[PDB]
Amino acid sequence: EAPAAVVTGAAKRIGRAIAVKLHQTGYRVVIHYHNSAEAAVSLADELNKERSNTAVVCQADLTNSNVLPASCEEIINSCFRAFGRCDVLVNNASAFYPTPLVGKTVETQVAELIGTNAIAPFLLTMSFAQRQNLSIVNLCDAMVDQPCMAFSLYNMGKHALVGLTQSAALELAPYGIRVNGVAPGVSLLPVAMGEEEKDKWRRKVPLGRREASAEQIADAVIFLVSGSAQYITGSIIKVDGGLSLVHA
Amino acid sequence: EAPAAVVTGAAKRIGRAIAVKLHQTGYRVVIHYHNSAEAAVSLADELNKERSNTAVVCQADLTNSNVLPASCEEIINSCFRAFGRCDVLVNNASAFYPTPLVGKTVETQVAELIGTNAIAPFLLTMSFAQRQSNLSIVNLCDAMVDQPCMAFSLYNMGKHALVGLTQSAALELAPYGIRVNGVAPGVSLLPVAMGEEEKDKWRRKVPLGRREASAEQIADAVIFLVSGSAQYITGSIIKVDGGLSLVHA
Amino acid sequence: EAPAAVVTGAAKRIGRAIAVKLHQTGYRVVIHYHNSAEAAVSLADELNKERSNTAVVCQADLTNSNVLPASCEEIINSCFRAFGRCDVLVNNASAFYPTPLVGKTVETQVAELIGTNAIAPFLLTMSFAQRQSNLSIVNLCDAMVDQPCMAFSLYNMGKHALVGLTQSAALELAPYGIRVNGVAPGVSLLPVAMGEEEKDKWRRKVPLGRREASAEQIADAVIFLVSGSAQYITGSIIKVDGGLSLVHA
Amino acid sequence: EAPAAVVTGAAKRIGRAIAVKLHQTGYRVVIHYHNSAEAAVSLADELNKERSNTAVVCQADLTNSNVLPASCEEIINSCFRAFGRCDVLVNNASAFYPTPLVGKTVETQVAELIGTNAIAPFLLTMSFAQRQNLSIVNLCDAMVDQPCMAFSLYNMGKHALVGLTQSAALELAPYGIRVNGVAPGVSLLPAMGEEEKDKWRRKVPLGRREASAEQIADAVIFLVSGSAQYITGSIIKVDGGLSLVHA
Ligand SMILES: NC(=O)c1ccc[n+]([C@@H]2O[C@H](COP(=O)([O-])OP(=O)(O)OC[C@H]3O[C@@H](n4cnc5c(N)ncnc54)[C@H](OP(=O)(O)O)[C@@H]3O)[C@@H](O)[C@H]2O)c1
Ligand SMILES: NC(=O)c1ccc[n+]([C@@H]2O[C@H](COP(=O)([O-])OP(=O)(O)OC[C@H]3O[C@@H](n4cnc5c(N)ncnc54)[C@H](OP(=O)(O)O)[C@@H]3O)[C@@H](O)[C@H]2O)c1
Ligand SMILES: NC(=O)c1ccc[n+]([C@@H]2O[C@H](COP(=O)([O-])OP(=O)(O)OC[C@H]3O[C@@H](n4cnc5c(N)ncnc54)[C@H](OP(=O)(O)O)[C@@H]3O)[C@@H](O)[C@H]2O)c1
Ligand SMILES: NC(=O)c1ccc[n+]([C@@H]2O[C@H](COP(=O)([O-])OP(=O)(O)OC[C@H]3O[C@@H](n4cnc5c(N)ncnc54)[C@H](OP(=O)(O)O)[C@@H]3O)[C@@H](O)[C@H]2O)c1
Ligand SMILES: CC(C)c1nc2nc(N)nc(N)c2nc1C(C)C
Ligand SMILES: CC(C)c1nc2nc(N)nc(N)c2nc1C(C)C
Ligand SMILES: CC(C)c1nc2nc(N)nc(N)c2nc1C(C)C
Ligand SMILES: CC(C)c1nc2nc(N)nc(N)c2nc1C(C)C
């Protein structure tokens, strides 16, 4: 039968593109979402119209808390309940907002930014391994070493995700599970973002002076889960048009 | 008038060596501790005997929780209460134990390892910067972060997050004249209870001298980073590992 | 018109797999070689039997010297003269042997190791760019560059320079639509010649399957990078090492 | 006996600051230079005026060639000739200029940029080790991963120098020789004038100022000192946060 994948934060944008491209490759998919219920259901309907019984949605908040491990176990469980297997996990969901060093409480900021970007990936990785061409792909960030000003908590999360990618690649290799990352530079600028700000970001990218499409990011995910990546584990592929190479 | 420093997890081992060297350089010190109360009080006593009222102790669990931000604020507050100023913060305290992917619950392991290694350092950095010369913060990192111990994902995640904080905070606090740096030990001060035969196994791996670092050697790099000789150094992580991280499998 | 690629050191092993896989993908190929004349011609014959007029050979020493810039110019020229275009350059050729710090003279060792691994890639890159769709360059790097083989300083220096080239050329050539990326093998295709103890030693270190990479698995990463599926990827180095570089001493 | 140090490209700027600082800490120094004869002799004179017979100059081109190994061996030899010992080697000399991919020939550019920044440090390291608190400090670059546009050969050279620092740290550890790097960001602005200087200054998070030569030398002094006895294969960035700033 067809293999199955879980994509977190898959209702919209890059997660959606990844879900779509996995589905087109022949995967059954769990579209995880938090708030974007309408987009998630609409996406599932469309994939199911294409091939019957090949998409389900699964709602979960991925903020850190004492119940986060159970929420992550349930996400993996939902893939098994729908499809009887879980071959691919894609950790895409992410909170991203400034937390200056010098309104959400700081405890909430910690829980959202660290939970979504790192702890949930860890717990989902745990549940995925425990339930078992298996692989996990973590959505990282090409700019981790030249971070956005005042984004310390977000940056800490993405750094933690690099650590998880390496530790899990090492530990899960004996089980045949590969763990890799895809690190976007600037990708899919919101149509609603101010045009002046869009231009500012695009002007920075050496390759084409434009942001990645969501499909370009998805392409690298597709490579990593494929038979063409069978010896690749612990690798993080930047997909950033050379943005990380530009000095101040 | 003398500068003042907070050192977390300063009762024993590397934190102790750091507190002692800072004190010897002329700093007044807050000795933070968690369970090591006798060691901490004894250390403060020793330092105060050397110079009157230049050391205080401050107890706090640095596990992630709803009360962790207030706890970190109180650690910084304790430096100001005692000394009227806080010039240096050393984020040394750290939980370290395996968390295999395949009697603590996982949510507790997350809270302790991410809390001690990453979140508390963040909240302490926030309180330090907000409460404000040669100001700086030194984070105790790990030379082996990219070749981690098997089954230590949460620990390794916590230390990676700390590298991220060191960079983000260096960038953001530079306009405020606060430098933020790291010291990354390889193998240091193996536990006296570790069998010598196993101590020799890690020792044999170290290119420079086939031995682990003393706590004092780690402290030496901290002393440098807080000194006027490092006035243009920020966002830098100094490995103190005797070549360990350069050795292939 | 079918696109054309140059592969250096393509007569055998990994370079051969790259040439074969590019050819299978529809590329016409220049098979560069140094000493392996019989294998190079044999490979050309084989590919030409598959599709007429799709493979040629080009001999050159890639050791550094006063004549190297002309040699690299002629390698690129061979692609234009044969195929009327050059879309892809793969910098695979490499000298690899120990140069301890404490028959070849040291200046010869420098010329061979830095020439093959770094300077030739630079001059070929120069020639390729100046002679100019989906254009790209792939440099064969090394996943163990930061945990190098003992006594291989010159080899390691060359591979580090190659990372620098990959990055510098990615930045500079991005405006011309030329992408520049790397593939970094761990251990790959152990020779039968090598000892049974030595080969086992290396194999048992690889977390993912306790075996070396096949040449085809290395070639798969090259194919991805030159493909339309990597159109936004430049300055990236993809490790293909089965997790070898993650394993501590 | 006082320890002795070789500093390459030490007639001016950062090399001189390092030479001056080592001398002040008690070292006897070989001031290597290439073209800056007057400046080198002048520094040796000032240092010898402070302490008699504690400085000598040594001329050498560090461009790659077949005689480069002999030249590097002779630099180390000159320290032993003058001082009877050689405790510290600082690889500071560097060529730095653009070499675009698209009147110096390319073979000259390769020779100068790879020679000065990488091959000469390798050859000096060999000769330093062979001739034996011993250590080597390499002058690297904090911006190696966000390079100057059209400086590929320079960038390759400094990357090779990171590789040397790591390889030699590993290999020379059994011999008790530590090998470390100092990676400046922007330091000492000259050739260049204001306002281009102030364009660079505005980039630096920590004080919007370039590093002083003194600040770079401070980091060198630390790595050679007893306070760094367990540090080897480490590269210390001295860049005021410059490398942390995104485009
Ligand atoms: N776009 C870029 O320029 C860029 C750059 C670097 C890295 N990345 C990385 O690439 C990935 C995708 O980027 P993107 O722009 O598509 O991301 P995004 O739109 O910012 O986030 C994707 C999804 O994350 C989910 N999410 C947020 N908070 C959550 C929570 N508490 N619990 C569960 N889910 C939560 C949201 O789901 P709901 O909508 O259902 O609420 C959201 O749709 C992310 O990991 C991101 O960090 C992106
Ligand atoms: N030792 C090494 O080989 C090595 C290697 C790499 C990195 N490092 C890093 O260097 C630093 C010093 O190492 P070390 O071996 O001296 O450290 P350690 O003994 O393992 O821990 C230092 C202190 O951290 C405090 N701590 C632990 N859990 C805590 C909690 N939940 N709340 C508050 N404090 C807590 C403890 O205080 P109490 O005793 O008072 O309870 C302990 O004394 C650490 O950051 C470590 O990760 C060390
Ligand atoms: N194999 C591995 O485990 C491994 C590990 C890390 C990195 N890599 C990298 O992957 C690439 C392929 O590895 P490999 O093992 O297939 O390589 P290899 O067999 O060691 O060498 C490839 C070719 O390099 C050519 N070459 C050597 N010296 C030359 C010179 N002076 N001038 C021109 N060409 C010269 C040779 O051509 P002729 O035979 O025609 O003389 C040789 O066939 C290399 O860049 C290597 O550094 C490989
Ligand atoms: N200054 C910065 O902003 C900066 C930034 C990053 C890294 N760095 C690194 O820090 C170190 C010092 O910087 P700097 O600006 O003081 O250096 P520099 O002035 O550009 O050069 C130092 C010396 O190198 C010598 N040199 C150049 N070509 C030579 C050759 N072919 N053979 C022998 N010697 C040669 C010159 O000696 P003569 O004058 O005697 O001919 C020169 O005085 C260098 O390694 C540099 O790459 C500096
Ligand atoms: C498209 C814009 C709004 C954007 N959105 C992001 N979303 C997440 N989750 N993570 C990022 N690093 C992220 N980064 C950007 C850019 C600022 C790079
Ligand atoms: C002395 C031994 C038990 C040891 N203890 C440690 N403690 C903390 N907190 N962090 C480490 N990275 C750490 N690392 C080691 C060694 C394995 C290096
Ligand atoms: C399989 C053996 C002979 C081997 N051969 C190599 N050849 C080149 N050119 N480069 C390497 N890094 C290289 N590395 C190895 C192993 C030590 C991995
Ligand atoms: C002060 C200016 C002229 C400058 N000079 C340099 N000299 C050398 N040798 N190396 C550099 N990386 C170097 N870099 C700069 C800046 C452009 C950073």
TrEMBL record, chain A:
Record: residues binding NADP(+): 12-14, 34-36, 61-63, 92, 94, 154, 158, 187-188
| Positions contributing to substrate binding | 135
Instruction: Determine if Oxidoreductase is one of this entry's keywords.
Output: yes
Q: Does the keyword Cell membrane apply?
A: no
Q: Give the residues annotated as active site.
A: 154 (proton acceptor)
> Where is the PTM Cysteine sulfenic acid (-SOH) found along the chain?
58, 148
Reported EC number(s) for this entry are 1.5.1.33
Enzyme group, top EC level? oxidoreductase
One GO molecular function term of this record is: oxidoreductase activity
Look up the domain of life of the source.
Answer: Eukaryota
Question: Which keywords annotate this record?
Answer: Nucleotide-binding, Oxidoreductase
Please state which protein family the record places this protein in. Answer: Belongs to the short-chain dehydrogenases/reductases (SDR) family.
This one is known as Pteridine reductase, putative
Tell me the organism.
Trypanosoma brucei brucei (strain 927/4 GUTat10.1)
Measured against the full-length protein, the chain present covers: 103 to 369 of 369
